[PDB]
């Protein structure tokens, strides 16, 4: 909890009971599966022995139906059914995982704090030059507490980046990008939810 | 997702039909019949190898029993006399190799003859 402060051209202390917890990596494995399963959609509906536009007459081995599953068109006795792939964790387990992924990147010298991230306009040239000053070559994260349209509209084209509000950080956001920029005003609001 | 899996049955059925190369007749093209013969081939190889160890010992007797019969001794009066007269753990297949000569093989019969009397 002793990360330094950044300010475009140019050390603080965060809640050590939030950003300095020893991680629990078992709670970070099952938490990712619960957030990844929901992403999938599950809209594969196959046909059955009774939903085939086929005969019911015994034609003539025995073979009482033409569309029985051992024939040429019309099978899939069991097949994939359109269900729901989204279960729920207990609430403290959802709460513990976001603390663990944030505290892990404190140790690795990966989080970078900014002060309020003020832009001029929605230009990408000004945003691209700002990334060079902070040296974030691959993917990143920009967390802003008030959802400024400028920064959001100035960082929606660059491929590795992805803008989002501070009330909506979750597991697959922070675990995927390995560098992250926070406004110093947003560091308070993540402590208040958890 | 549907898994076709047509490409994995080509490679498994080829590896049998290479091991059946050289068999007579239709037993080296058809998978239904070559698979009945790679099974009885490996099962016959296990018995052949075991029977090969008890066979060659059956061969080495009938050469020792003739090479000793030049000197009046049979195989019984030889093996039994070579286990008391002196210490010569000469292997059946190892002694048969030295039985070709007159002189080295007869040197044991003479020693056994002295212990037999």
């Amino acid at each position: 909890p002793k990360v330094a402060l950044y300010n475009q051209n140019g050390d603080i202390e965060l809640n050590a009971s939030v950003f300095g917890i020893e991680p629990n990596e078992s709670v970070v494995f099952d938490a990712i599966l619960m957030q990844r399963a929901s992403l999938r959609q599950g809209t594969h509906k196959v046909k059955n022995r009774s939903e085939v536009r086929g005969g019911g007459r015994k034609p003539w081995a025995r073979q009482g139906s033409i569309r029985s599953p051992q024939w040429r068109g019309g099978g899939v006795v069991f097949g994939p059914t359109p269900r729901s792939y989204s279960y729920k964790l207990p609430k403290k387990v959802r709460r513990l995982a976001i603390k663990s992924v944030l505290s892990s990147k404190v140790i690795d010298n990966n989080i970078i704090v900014l002060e309020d991230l003020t832009l001029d306009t929605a230009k990408t040239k000004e945003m691209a030059a700002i990334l060079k000053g902070l040296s974030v070559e691959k993917k990143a994260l920009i967390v802003t507490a008030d959802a400024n349209e400028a920064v959001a509209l100035s960082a929606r084209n660059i491929p590795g980046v992805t803008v989002v509000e501070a009330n909506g950080i979750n597991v697959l956001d922070v675990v995927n990008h390995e560098k992250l920029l926070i406004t110093k005003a947003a560091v308070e609001k993540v402590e208040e939810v958890l | 997702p549907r898994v076709k899996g047509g490409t994995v049955t080509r490679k498994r059925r080829k590896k049998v039909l290479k091991l059946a190369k050289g068999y007579f007749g239709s037993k080296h093209t058809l998978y239904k019949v070559a698979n009945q013969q790679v099974m009885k081939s490996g099962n016959y190889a296990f018995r052949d190898r075991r029977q090969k160890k008890r066979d060659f010992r059956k061969l080495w007797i009938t050469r020792i029993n003739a090479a000793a019969r030049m000197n009046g001794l049979s195989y019984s009066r030889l093996m039994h006399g070579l286990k008391l007269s002196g210490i010569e753990v000469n292997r059946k297949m190892l002694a048969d190799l030295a039985v070709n000569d007159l002189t080295a093989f007869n040197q044991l019969a003479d020693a056994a003859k002295a212990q037999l009397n």
Partner: protein, 128 residues
């Protein structure tokens, strides 16, 4: 944690026993089922009847008042807020299992006779 090396917890996962795929795994041909696969409760007579309105009050070991700050105005609407009782039903009955500590104002629908003296010994009031 990085997204490449997601090692699960040991014993937290298990592979599905897939039944009927080949003789080598076991459950090969007959699929783990094998070849060719008056009761007692209808001899025991029924037991009287049931009451249409049974009044069951919330009971708390006498030992539930040993973890509270000061015996004062211990009304059931504070028992239910802090959550020593999970749910107020008809009435709140106090049981005399356990040892009390100091005096604490108690407000209950009923009282056990052994429970009545133990609050009356520590210095508490039993207002029903």
């Amino acid at each position: 944690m990085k997204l490449h090396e997601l090692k699960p917890s040991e014993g937290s996962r298990k592979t599905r026993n897939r039944v009927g795929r080949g003789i080598g795994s076991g459950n090969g041909k007959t699929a783990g089922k094998g070849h060719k696969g008056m009761p007692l409760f209808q001899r025991l007579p029924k037991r009287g009847f049931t009451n249409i309105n049974r009044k069951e009050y919330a009971v708390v070991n006498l030992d539930k008042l040993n973890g509270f700050a000061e015996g004062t105005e211990v009304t059931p609407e504070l028992l239910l807020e802090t959550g020593v009782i999970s749910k107020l039903n008809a009435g709140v009955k106090i049981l005399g299992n356990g040892k009390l500590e100091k005096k604490l104002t108690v407000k209950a629908n009923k009282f056990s006779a052994s429970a009545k003296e133990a609050v009356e010994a520590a210095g508490g009031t039993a207002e029903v």
